[PDB]
């Protein structure tokens, strides 16, 4: 594959992060990306070469495969893992403009030895005391909770299409009325049980994701109610 | 074919009757004999294998066939023309059996050259005067009655049949819904148009021979009322 940049910008963004943001990019990297790309996406590697009809109708297999499958379940899970990736770079974004405001301010205090005591309260404001500890206050706990909650929201809207247009098993054999077709035809799919397999795995590890930053969400707002 | 046996006893049979019998024998030797086995029979000469349907399930083609087609036209006109000339040899051998008759009592009298006034009225009895003129009185008529109504209503009890099983068309398309063929399925029959002309030709000569033979009851009735 090409997950090469995206994971590079992961692992540059995990360095400072909360607990539980620290297990979710865990578990989306060993989980979602590892694992789709060893295995699970050679099972379907002939979804189309293996579909086959009852019928000498010219025409009507590719027909009543387009009628089956309107979108590849991996092609969906790959769009699934690109859109509930963005926010952490969004915060990965603002952590570097707080850096960026951290050495101009340090810069300019470097300079200087009433203006220490803005500097120091700049620089408290932002959570920039340690030079290299930067705290989440004010600004960044809004933009992380934001991402959270887009995340969440990505995420449940994405199980709620496939929900309504696959569902969540594969049955061996699928009916076909479209055209060219006369009447009505008999279609049989290719490796029902592995795919309802891994469907059902990769529904569990979505709901233990979900759970998971529903999990960091409440901690995060405990450690704010805190100060 | 092997009409040659029935060809000769009506030949036998056709010296002694009426005109409308000897006109119902020859509209029956033309056009039901001669035109069946010229050409007729020629054009089911491949309604099997040119049958063909829209589906690759194996012994759904033998189903439909004998679905679409119970029974075949030609056989079903053979049959026909079978039981529409009985009542013609019973008549046949009623006149043999009076000819019987004729030659003892013949015989009978010659050897005795109130004797000869019991020969008289027997010979007057059975219309037989002449020594070769036999005429219809008591026991022919009421045969040659009987005969023409078996006819009549063996041909109309056939042409039901038919009606009720076939029609009197073919259709270029038929729709063919029967184990193992899954769901429903199209096959397309051999010459439908060929078919449907002869068909509709077959039925104007079969009420064509009723009518002539509506039209001989009623001349023999009048004739017997002429007495
Ligand atoms: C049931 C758990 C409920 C809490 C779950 C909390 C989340 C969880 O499960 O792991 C993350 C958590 C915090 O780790 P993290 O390094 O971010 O935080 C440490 C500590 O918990 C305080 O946050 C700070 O120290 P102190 O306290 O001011 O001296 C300081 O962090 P910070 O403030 O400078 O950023 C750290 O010493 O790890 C723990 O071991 C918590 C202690 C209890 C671990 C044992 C379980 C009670
Ligand atoms: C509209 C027709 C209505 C009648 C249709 C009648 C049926 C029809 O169309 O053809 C058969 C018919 C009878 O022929 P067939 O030879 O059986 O009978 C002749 C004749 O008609 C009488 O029956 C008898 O003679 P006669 O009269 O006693 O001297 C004698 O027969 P039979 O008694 O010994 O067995 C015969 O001379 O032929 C005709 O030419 C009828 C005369 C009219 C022909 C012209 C048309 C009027």
């Known amino acids: 594959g090409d997950w090469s940049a995206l994971g590079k910008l992961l692992d540059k963004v995990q360095a400072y992060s909360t607990a539980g943001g620290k297990v979710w990019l865990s578990v989306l990297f060993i989980f979602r990306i590892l694992l789709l790309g060893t295995a699970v996406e050679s099972a379907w590697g002939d979804e189309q070469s293996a579909f086959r009809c009852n019928t000498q109708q010219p025409g009507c297999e590719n027909v009543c495969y387009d009628k089956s499958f309107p979108i590849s379940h991996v092609r969906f899970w790959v769009l ?29 205090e470097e300079e200087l030895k009433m203006h220490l005591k803005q500097i120091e309260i700049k620089k408290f404001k932002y959570g920039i ?13 809004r933009t992380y909770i934001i991402s959270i909650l887009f995340k969440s929201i990505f995420e449940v809207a994405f199980l709620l299409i496939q929900w309504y247009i696959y569902g969540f098993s594969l049955s061996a054999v699928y009916t076909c009325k479209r055209d060219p077709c006369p009447h009505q035809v008999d279609c049989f799919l290719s490796r029902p049980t592995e795919k309802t397999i891994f469907i059902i795995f990769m529904l569990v590890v979505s709901l233990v994701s979900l759970a998971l930053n529903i999990i960091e969400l409440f901690y995060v707002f405990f450690k704010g109610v805190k100060d």
Do not use: C, D, W
Not at 87 to 94: G, K, Q, S
Not at 129 to 141: D, T
């Open 80 to 108: 699934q893992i690109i859109f509930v990736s963005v926010p952490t770079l969004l915060y990965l974004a603002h952590v570097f403009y707080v850096m960026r405001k951290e050495e101009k301010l340090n810069k300019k």
């Open 129 to 141: 005391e340690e030079h290299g500890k930067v705290k989440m206050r004010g600004g960044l706990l």
